[PDB]
Write a protein that binds this ligand. Structure first.
Ligand code: CL
Ligand code: MG
Length: 222
């Protein structure tokens, strides 16, 4: 029985994977870019500790467990007493702890993981940008790589020309719309783009209370 809740067909997933392979086979990375690329591949693997229910390869019976994470995420996103960064990180933590979540939750998880890693001295992580094709969330790292933990795919982006790879791989997925970002100066932005000074003020507490001392969000090979 195919997964009746699949949001993409097997054919659609295969076509995206083939385009990602085309991009990756054509890129050559320098030594520092290769280090970040390896971190990105590792982070996408760690995101597979979270199961979705909306891929054609997923188990339809996991929909009721994903739903518990989705209820929490919806309640959290609607709260008026939390910053946007806190909401995103709370959902990342709930999704990783439960083991269930779809593309939004898995993108939030990798955002949280890489934000934690960015606190280390001379981390190669400098900017993080969550963005969406309609409801399909992805993460752009350093304006140089795109990560899709839902599909366990990633690829580099041409400098000064990132729409080349994005427009090829995600042709027919629609316009990419920003959701939340942190730049190299530590400034936070929501989506037109609006600065989010409350998340900036809250950044240290978000990192401490939701990310620190959780084996989930810590990497050691680096
Ligand atoms: Cl790092
Ligand atoms: Mg870089």
């Amino acid at each position: 029985k195919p997964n009746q809740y699949a949001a993409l067909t097997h054919s659609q997933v295969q076509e995206v994977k083939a385009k990602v392979r085309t991009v990756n086979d054509k890129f050559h990375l320098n030594a520092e870019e290769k280090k970040l690329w390896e971190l990105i591949l590792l982070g996408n693997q760690l995101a597979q500790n979270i199961s979705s229910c909306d891929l054609p390869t997923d188990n339809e019976d996991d929909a009721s467990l994903v739903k518990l994470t989705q209820i929490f995420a919806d309640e959290t996103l609607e709260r008026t007493d939390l910053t946007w960064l806190n909401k995103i990180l709370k959902i990342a933590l709930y999704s990783r702890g439960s083991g269930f979540g779809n593309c939004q939750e898995k993108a939030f998880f990798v955002f949280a993981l890489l934000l934690h890693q960015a606190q280390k001295p001379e981390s190669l992580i400098h900017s993080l940008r969550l963005a969406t094709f309609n409801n399909h969330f992805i993460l752009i790292v350093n304006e140089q790589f795109l990560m899709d933990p839902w599909l366990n795919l990633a690829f580099p982006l041409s400098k000064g020309n990132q729409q080349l790879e994005i427009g090829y791989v995600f042709e027919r997925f629609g316009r990419l719309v920003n959701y939340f970002s942190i730049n190299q100066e530590g400034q936070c932005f929501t989506h037109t783009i609006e600065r989010d000074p409350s998340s900036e003020k809250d950044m240290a507490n978000c990192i401490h209370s939701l990310l620190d001392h959780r084996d989930y969000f810590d990497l050691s090979i680096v």
